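Regression check, amino group case 400:
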Amino acid sequence: ANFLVHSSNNFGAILSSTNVGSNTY
Amino acid sequence: ANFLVHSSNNFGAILSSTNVGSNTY
Amino acid sequence: ANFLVHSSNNFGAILSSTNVGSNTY
Amino acid sequence: ANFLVHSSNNFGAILSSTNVGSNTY
Amino acid sequence: ANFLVHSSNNFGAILSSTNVGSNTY
Amino acid sequence: ANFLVHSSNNFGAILSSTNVGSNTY
Amino acid sequence: ANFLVHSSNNFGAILSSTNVGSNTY
Amino acid sequence: ANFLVHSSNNFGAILSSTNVGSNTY
Amino acid sequence: ANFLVHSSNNFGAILSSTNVGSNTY
Amino acid sequence: ANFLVHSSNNFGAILSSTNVGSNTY
Amino acid sequence: ANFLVHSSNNFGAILSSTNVGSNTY
Amino acid sequence: ANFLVHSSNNFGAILSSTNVGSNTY
Amino acid sequence: ANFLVHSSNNFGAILSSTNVGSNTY
Amino acid sequence: ANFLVHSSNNFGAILSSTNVGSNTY
Amino acid sequence: ANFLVHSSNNFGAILSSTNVGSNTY
Amino acid sequence: ANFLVHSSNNFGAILSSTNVGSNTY
Ligand SMILES: [N]
Ligand SMILES: [N]
Ligand SMILES: [N]
Ligand SMILES: [N]
Ligand SMILES: [N]
Ligand SMILES: [N]
Ligand SMILES: [N]
Ligand SMILES: [N]
Ligand SMILES: [N]
Ligand SMILES: [N]
Ligand SMILES: [N]
Ligand SMILES: [N]
Ligand SMILES: [N]
Ligand SMILES: [N]
Ligand SMILES: [N]
Ligand SMILES: [N]
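Current build output:
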């Protein structure tokens, strides 16, 4: 899996993942 | 899975994932 | 897996991973 | 796996990993 | 695995690893 | 594995490793 | 493995290693 | 393995090693 | 000035201040 | 000035201050 | 000035101060 | 000035101060 | 001034002070 | 001034002081 | 002034003082 | 002034003092 992101002063949340099982936030 | 995002001063939330099981936010 | 990110004064959270099992945040 | 990140005064959290098993945060 | 990061006064946490087994934080 | 990092007055934690087995923090 | 790091008054923790077996912190 | 580090009044911990077996901290 | 806020898992940005001079985000 | 905030797993940025002069983010 | 905050696993940045002069982030 | 904070595994930065003069981060 | 804080495995920076004059980070 | 803090494996920096004059970090 | 702190394997820096004059770190 | 601290394998620096005059680190 490749991860390429370009951010600049982001007050917001940037989520990007791949879960095979249960996950909690 | 590839992840390519371009953001700039985003006050909003940017969600992008793939869950196979249960997930909570 | 490759990891390339470019950030600059980001008050927000930047998540980017790949979980095969259960994970909690 | 390659890890290349460019940050500058980031008050936010920058997560980037690859877990094969269970992980907790 | 190569590790190249450029940080400057980062109050946030910068995580970047590759776990084959279970890991806890 | 190569390790090249450039930090300057970082109040945050900078983690960068590669574990084949279990690890705890 | 090469180790090159440049720090200056870092109140934060800078971890950078490569473990083949179990490790605890 | 080469070891080159440049520190100046670092209150934080600077870890950089390569373990083939189990290690505890 | 009083500051009372109640948040719970907010992916969005919550700004609330009072500037008398110029300010940039 | 009083500061009372209640947060729980907030991926977003929570800003709350009072500047009399110029400020940059 | 009183400071009372309750946080729990916050990936986001929580700023809360009062500046009379110029300040940079 | 009183300082009471309750944190638990916070990857984000928690700033809370009161500056009368100029300050830089 | 009273200082009471409760932290547990915090990868983020926790700042809490009161400066009457100029301060740099 | 009273100082009571409870930490456990904190990779982040925990600052808590009261300066009447100029201070540099 | 009373000083009571409880730490356990802290890789981060724990500062807690009260300066009336100028101080440098 | 009373001094009571409990540490265990701390790689980080633990500062706790009270200066009335100028001090350098
Ligand atoms: N969460
Ligand atoms: N959530
Ligand atoms: N979490
Ligand atoms: N956590
Ligand atoms: N943790
Ligand atoms: N830990
Ligand atoms: N540890
Ligand atoms: N340890
Ligand atoms: N910004
Ligand atoms: N910024
Ligand atoms: N900044
Ligand atoms: N900074
Ligand atoms: N700094
Ligand atoms: N510093
Ligand atoms: N310093
Ligand atoms: N110093």
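Comparison notes: The beta strands of chain P are 2-6, 14-19, 23-24. Chain P is about 0% helix and 50% strand. No diff flagged against the previous build.
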